[PDB]
Amino acid sequence: GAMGSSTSGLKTTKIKFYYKDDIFALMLKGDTTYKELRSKIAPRIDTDNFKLQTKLFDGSGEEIKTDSQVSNIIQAKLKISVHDI
């Protein structure tokens, strides 16, 4: 353990997405990007056009749309919400 980084952001981040009434979970090793997540949810959505946000509590939050928003939901483990678009 501990060797210059050793999983800087703890281990894989567990992020539960909320596509419609169904929900799943993704494990980001820290490199997951916004486009990588897009190809990781597309098949878990059943569509190629969807939107991801920082599932807060009322409905959704920051609409993840950049490798930083995802790596942020990765360092903060934010529930993600998926909508069909």
Q: What is the rounded distance in angstroms from the CA atom of residue 20 to the CA atom of residue 27? A: 20
Number of C-beta neighbours around residue 42 at 10 A: 13
Q: Are strands 13-19 and 24-28 parallel, antiparallel or unpaired?
A: antiparallel
DSSP one-letter string for 29-54: -S---HHHHHHHHHHHHTSS-EEEEE
Q: Nearest to residue 19, comparing CAs of 83, 85, 62?
A: 83
Query: ∠ CA(50), CA(62), CA(51), 5° rounding?
Result: 0
| Four-way CATH pick for 1-85: 3.90.1210.10, 3.40.718.10, 3.10.20.90, 3.20.20.70 | 3.10.20.90
3-state secondary structure of 15: strand
Q: How was this structure determined?
A: NMR
